[PDB]
Design a protein around this ligand. Structure first.
Ligand SMILES: CCCCCCCC/C=C\CCCCCCCC(=O)OC[C@H](O)CO
Ligand SMILES: CCCCCCCC/C=C\CCCCCCCC(=O)OC[C@H](O)CO
Ligand SMILES: CCCCCCCC/C=C\CCCCCCCC(=O)OC[C@H](O)CO
Ligand SMILES: *C/C=C(C)/C=C/C=C(C)/C=C/C1=C(C)CCCC1(C)C
Ligand SMILES: CCCCCCCC/C=C\CCCCCCCC(=O)O
Ligand SMILES: CCCCCCCC/C=C\CCCCCCCC(=O)O
Ligand SMILES: CCCCCCCC/C=C\CCCCCCCC(=O)O
Ligand SMILES: CCCCCCCC/C=C\CCCCCCCC(=O)O
Ligand SMILES: CCCCCCCC/C=C\CCCCCCCC(=O)O
Ligand SMILES: CCCCCCCC/C=C\CCCCCCCC(=O)O
Ligand SMILES: [Cl-]
Length: 262
């Protein structure tokens, strides 16, 4: 009842489009899961955890998208020409809780292919995960107010954005100071990964703000469309680039299975 989805009835077209976006997302993530599993054998031991992390991200996100899809169909029934709320079973809060797990995985796979190790790896991962959890937790509290108190959504969102900015500064600083260590020309690729991340991750706060600027049933659809674009870009496309970097550096380091695969 704290999310705008509960305020509206939906046309068949709106309801089915949201359902199809979520189910398509499930399929894309589980198809990518198989790809990452199969190619892990072509990654040198030093980087193989990066591809395993993509597998974990695919199943984590795919399970949450599947849960959202079933919750969506459980919550609404077609009555008198529209889909109307029957049960309090749908909310976006499950996405936020899941980010507590998937964001650390996405960040850790980056640090691994950047060739960080030992104390710098552990220290950098700790600050990044704390910053990310601060961003997620404050955003989670903010969206509890997207119906009742837009001013509160905005203030928690400002606090969350401060964590996002500091997190991005840590990431960008480590990338630019370490790309010279990267093998096989991936010093160029990693810069594109950073820009892909900046673009894709910024779509999430835009979705968070939909209740402030498009508080209607079409805004509900737009938010799910933005989450879909952002999920595929930040998890699947990003994961494919991380895997490319991992295989390319593996081959440059003399790992035969990587050399033959390329
Ligand atoms: C009264 C309410 C409380 C107000 C306070 C809440 C807001 C504080 C937010 C950010 C400050 C922390 C930023 C400090 C981060 C420095 C550590 C760091 O980033 O290390 C990166 C390094 O590159 C890796 O080795
Ligand atoms: C809540 C409202 C507060 C609004 C606050 C607005 C300030 C935005 C500024 C920067 C965004 C952070 C983007 C980080 C981009 C990476 C920067 C970086 O990596 O620096 C390069 C490095 O110095 C080379 O060695
Ligand atoms: C969802 C679509 C996944 C299917 C193909 C993506 C291929 C994109 C290439 C990403 C880098 C991986 C690579 O090039 O090497 C793997 C090769 O297939 C070793 O047999
Ligand atoms: C696969 C999921 C990903 C990459 C999720 C990323 C989420 C964010 C970058 C969330 C950012 C937020 C803000 C910067 C302020 C508004 C609240 C958030 C949590 C939506
Ligand atoms: C190879 C693997 C290919 C992808 C595998 C995905 C298989 C089917 C996904 C099932 C999602 C169905 C959810 C429907 C729930 C609902 O909307 O009511
Ligand atoms: C589609 C189902 C799985 C296909 C992946 C199994 C084939 C293994 C190929 C690995 C190799 O070439 O060494
Ligand atoms: C309060 C929360 C703090 C969370 C900190 C998490 C720390 C994680 C640190 C690094 C994990 C990396 C483990 C795998 C190392 C891979 C390196 C390799 O095998 O080449
Ligand atoms: C359990 C998750 C791990 C928590 C550790 C991460 C700490 C990060 C920043 C804490 C942010 C505090 C915001 C809580 C206030 C919300 C409220 O009380 O209404
Ligand atoms: C770490 C968290 C940093 C500070 C969070 C401050 C936001 C609190 C807004 C509360 C709004 C209210 O209840 O009146
Ligand atoms: C996620 C990015 C967050 C950006 C920070 C928000 C910037 C705040 C700008 C002006 C706030 C104006 C407050 C007006 C409250 C409206 C109350 C209402 O109409 O219900
Ligand atoms: Cl997720």
């Amino acid at each position: 009842m704290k999310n705008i989805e509960s305020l509206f009835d939906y046309s068949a077209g709106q309801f089915e489009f949201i359902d199809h976006l979520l189910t398509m997302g499930v399929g894309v993530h589980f198809a990518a899961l198989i790809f990452f599993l199969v190619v892990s054998q072509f990654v040198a031991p030093k980087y193989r955890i990066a591809t395993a992390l993509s597998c974990i991200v695919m199943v984590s996100a795919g399970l949450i998208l599947n849960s959202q899809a079933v919750m969506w169909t459980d919550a609404y029934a077609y009555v008198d020409g529209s889909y109307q709320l029957q049960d309090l079973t749908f909310s976006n809060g499950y996405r936020y809780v899941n980010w507590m797990a998937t964001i650390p995985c996405l960040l850790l796979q980056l640090l691994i292919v950047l060739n960080l190790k030992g104390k710098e790896l552990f220290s950098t991962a700790t600050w990044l995960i704390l910053a990310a959890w601060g961003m997620i937790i404050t955003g989670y509290v903010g969206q509890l107010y997207e119906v009742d108190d837009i001013a509160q959504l905005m203030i928690w969102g400002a606090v969350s954005t401060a964590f996002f900015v500091v997190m991005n500064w840590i990431v960008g600083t480590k990338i630019f100071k370490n790309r010279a260590t990267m093998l096989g020309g991936t010093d160029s690729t990693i810069t594109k990964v950073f820009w892909l991340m900046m673009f894709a991750w910024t779509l999430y706060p835009i979705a968070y703000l939909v209740p402030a600027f498009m508080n209607n049933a079409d805004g509900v659809v737009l938010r799910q469309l933005l989450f879909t674009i952002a999920d595929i870009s930040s998890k699947v496309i990003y994961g494919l680039m991380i895997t490319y970097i991992a295989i390319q550096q593996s081959a440059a380091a003399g790992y035969v299975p990587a050399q033959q695969a390329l």
